[PDB]
């Protein structure tokens, strides 16, 4: 049943791996990821080594999210698990976690970096995130960190959801960076208890940049990025400023001078009317009044590609240990089963 082992050093850590993976070679805080070619498929895969990943209560339940999340994935345009494995013989010498994926080449950033593309490919690639979204959320699972740099995307235009939120730090949210630029206002300043909503804005931003070849909201600061948004959706009215929690927030949205919504189509210059529209309604403050991914798949900008018996939905997912409390060793005894009973696709 257990495959062998080798071991080897590579770039100051070692690596023991089953034989079937060859010719690793470093690729690139979670971990470190070698590229090898898996011989029992002839796929070529990336395969990263957890690091540290039972140091603390956190970081234990971090690693059993990361797999259950994983294993449960299984669609067209959301990256799945290929294998996991660990070299122990026990639950008692086991330590390490190793995870196999496909190996991703591009990523949206190359497919748009400076340059805005023609409105077929805009409707294929928001398609296909719009189809993957839709099984994600079916199985309430909310991704939190959809940006250009999470999508990855092959030479026929084909796409893969990857980097799936596991809960970034405050350095990492600070400033000039792209790592903010795409988040939901009411997530960006704590407003509220968010939902699966978040990831519509965020593919709104995405189908912005690729219609203009520009990030939608490149704001310097949160409070920057906050005028930039308010200026293109207007400011809230008394509805929205009920459903923020924190008094202050209320107090600092009312200081800011009103504004109305703009004109979406002065704003996105010669864009298909279609897409505006679709714009128009993902881009909303409100999150209660956004799209979901199940409608907007039926929205007319997609209307060749939209196959209401090809859009499938996820097998339900059993997420009740997010709110339990366990020790370390527990933690790390459920990873372990989840390890050995892995079963690989077909
Ligand atoms: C500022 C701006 C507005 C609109 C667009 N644009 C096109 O060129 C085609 C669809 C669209 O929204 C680009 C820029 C740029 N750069
Ligand atoms: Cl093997
Ligand atoms: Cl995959
Ligand atoms: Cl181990
Ligand atoms: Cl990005
Ligand atoms: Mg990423």
Redesign the pocket.
């Known amino acids: 049943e257990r495959p062998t082992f080798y071991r080897q050093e590579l770039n100051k850590t070692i690596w023991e791996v089953p034989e079937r993976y060859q010719n690793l070679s470093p690729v690139g805080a979670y971990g470190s990821v070698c590229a090898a070619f898996d011989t029992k498929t002839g796929h070529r895969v990336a395969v990263k080594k957890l690091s540290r990943p039972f140091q603390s209560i956190i970081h234990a339940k971090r690693t059993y999210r990361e797999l259950r999340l994983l294993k449960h994935m299984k669609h067209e345009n959301v990256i799945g698990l290929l294998d996991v494995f660990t070299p122990a013989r026990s639950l008692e010498e086991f330590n390490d976690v190793y995870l196999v994926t496909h190996l991703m080449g591009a990523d949206l950033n190359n497919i748009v970096k400076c340059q805005?593309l023609t409105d077929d490919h805009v409707q294929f690639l928001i398609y296909q995130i719009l189809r993957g979204l839709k099984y994600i959320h079916s199985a309430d699972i909310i991704h939190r960190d959809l940006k250009p740099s999470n999508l990855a995307v092959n030479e026929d235009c084909e796409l893969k959801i990857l980097d799936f939120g596991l809960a970034h730090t405050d350095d990492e949210m600070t400033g000039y960076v792209a790592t903010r630029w795409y988040r939901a206002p009411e997530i960006m300043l704590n407003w509220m208890h968010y939902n699966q909503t978040v990831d519509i804005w965020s593919v709104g931003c995405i189908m912005a940049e690729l219609?203009?070849?520009?990030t939608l909201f490149p704001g310097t600061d949160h409070i920057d990025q906050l005028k930039l948004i308010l200026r293109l959706v207007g400011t809230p009215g008394a509805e929205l400023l009920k459903k923020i929690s924190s008094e202050s927030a209320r107090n600092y949205i009312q200081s800011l001078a009103q504004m109305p919504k703009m004109n979406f189509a002065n704003?996105?210059?010669?864009?298909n009317p279609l897409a505006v529209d679709l714009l128009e309604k993902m881009l909303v403050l409100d999150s209660d009044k956004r799209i979901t991914a199940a409608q907007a798949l039926a929205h007319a900008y997609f209307a060749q590609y939209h196959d209401p018996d090809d859009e499938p939905v996820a097998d339900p997912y059993d997420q009740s240990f997010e709110s339990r409390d366990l020790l370390i060793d527990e933690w790390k005894s459920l990873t372990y089963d989840e390890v050995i009973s892995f079963v690989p696709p077909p």
């Not at 219609?211 to 520009?214: D, E, H, I, P, V």
């Not at 704003?267 to 864009?271: E, K, L």
């Open positions: 805005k219609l203009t070849g520009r704003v996105f210059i010669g864009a």
